[PDB]
């Protein structure tokens, strides 16, 4: 299940594996648009706190959902700022969301007291005063309920079928960048004196394998001249020996 778009889920993802590749392996998201820079170039780039904005909207409600655009969903439910380095991922979920009779579990804010602020929502059930005379949380004249039930039926149109939409707003903050992929990690070659680049550790020499028992906290070894002698793998943890090749 997903959330409403008047009240969408702000899933802050930190400490994450290479998964943009999997997001390409899916190849099923209808509106798989990706902003800031083209999606593939965000593959190994790592943000600190990727904000998944999780909700369900309509195929015409996603028309309004775009960086810097307006609309009932983009003004009273989920506004997208123009500056957007994230990634909007919408896919038709008529089979999952909609059930026989109409999936009214999700609601949406057709009208609000005011407009929505970048990357925010409004769960306030307080009945807005559409007109002048007040009602103070009660129903009546010049006041309407802020929440409205979707039409989410199995017979909804392609422009109205319930699209499950996760907006992975990729956020580069000053914290250490957590969520990144392989970071251009090429495959290791063995038994070839080379410049091994082991998490920034630069060094040249014949890279053989090591029987040297590096206790789990021992990634790379060192020598009497602050030179690493026995190293290890970052991706698929495995130990190795070094002998600087012939001068």
């Amino acid at each position: 299940r997903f959330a409403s778009v008047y009240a969408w889920n702000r899933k802050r993802i930190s400490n994450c594996v290479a998964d943009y590749s999997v997001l390409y392996n899916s190849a099923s998201f209808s509106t798989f648009k990706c902003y800031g820079v083209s999606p593939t170039k965000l593959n190994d780039l790592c943000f600190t706190n990727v904000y998944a904005d999780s909700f369900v909207i309509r195929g015409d409600e996603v028309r309004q959902i775009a960086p810097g655009q307006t609309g009932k969903i983009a003004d009273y439910n989920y506004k997208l700022p123009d500056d957007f380095t994230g990634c909007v991922i919408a896919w038709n979920s008529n089979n999952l969301d909609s059930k026989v009779g109409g999936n009214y579990n999700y609601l949406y804010r057709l009208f609000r007291k005011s407009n929505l602020k970048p990357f925010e929502r409004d769960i306030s059930t307080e009945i807005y005063q559409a007109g002048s005379t007040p009602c103070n949380g009660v129903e009546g004249f010049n006041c309407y309920f802020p929440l409205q039930s979707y039409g989410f039926q199995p017979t909804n149109g392609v422009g109205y079928q319930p699209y499950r939409v996760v907006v992975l707003s990729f956020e580069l903050l000053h914290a250490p960048a957590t969520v990144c992929g392989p970071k251009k990690s090429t495959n290791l070659v063995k038994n070839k004196c080379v410049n091994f680049n082991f998490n920034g550790l630069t060094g040249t020499g014949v890279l053989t394998e090591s029987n040297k028992k590096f206790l789990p906290f021992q990634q790379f070894g060192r020598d009497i001249a602050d030179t690493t002698d026995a190293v290890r793998d970052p991706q698929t943890l495995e130990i190795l020996d070094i002998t600087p090749c012939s001068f």
Epitope: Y104, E126, G137, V138, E139, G140, F141, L147, S149
Partner: antibody, heavy 118, light 108 residues
């Protein structure tokens, strides 16, 4: 999706009785609720409103005996204290909800009988 | 003052498959804030028409609400034997809310 009401019965006039409406299926917090009266042979006469979204209580000026309405939202319940009763108030009480062009949540309890007689 | 309603007729004995016209007239000019309820004696009020011009799910087009201002009408068509019940008109314009006195369709 369901409403249970406390046990009604006979009471001497001028007394006060707490009447509970507890809900199930969905919460009473997100919505408001109403108390309606129906006497045998009488039409549905609304009595009172409770709205948890803010804080206010609206009573009927046709039947104004300060039947005070309050909430217990920890368990989906609302209490109407019947005060300054009179013989005509003998009727079945209904815990109701009005679908005013926005939501479809008009749910009604089973209805219990209050009797004001010595 | 309060907003008065009048349901005409308050009782009507009908037959199979007629075209009965249940009017709810209001003391004031209410745009569309009127609803219709079905209720067998002892049951819960089943909403029939909301906004006085819109059908309800589960209820076919045999029911049809219309009107505006002060004059609203439940225009029921093709009366089948399970339609004979107590029907109500409801206002939702201002507070307090007033319901109709009830109209009873019954078989002859």
């Amino acid at each position: 999706q369901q409403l249970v009401e406390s046990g009604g019965g006979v009471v001497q006039p001028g007394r006060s009785l707490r009447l509970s409406c507890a809900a199930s299926g969905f919460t009473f917090s997100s919505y408001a609720m109403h108390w309606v009266r129906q006497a045998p042979g009488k039409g549905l006469e609304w009595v009172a409103v409770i709205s948890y979204d803010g804080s206010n209580k609206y009573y009927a000026d046709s039947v104004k005996g300060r039947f005070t309405i309050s909430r217990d939202n920890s368990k989906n319940t609302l209490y109407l204290q019947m005060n300054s009763l009179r013989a005509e108030d003998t009727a079945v009480y209904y815990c109701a909800r009005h679908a005013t062009l926005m939501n479809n949540k008009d749910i009604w309890g089973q209805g219990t009988l209050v009797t004001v007689s010595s | 003052g309060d907003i008065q309603l009048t349901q005409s007729p308050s009782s009507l004995s009908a037959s199979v498959g007629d075209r009965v016209t249940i009017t709810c007239r209001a003391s004031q000019s209410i745009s569309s804030y009127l609803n219709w309820y079905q209720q067998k004696p002892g049951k819960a009020p089943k909403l029939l028409i909301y906004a006085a011009s819109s059908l309800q799910s589960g209820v076919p087009s045999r029911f049809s609400g219309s009107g505006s201002g002060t004059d609203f009408t439940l225009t029921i068509s093709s009366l089948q034997p399970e339609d004979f019940a107590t029907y109500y008109c409801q206002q939702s314009y201002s507070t307090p809310r007033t319901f109709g006195q009830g109209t009873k369709v019954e078989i002859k």
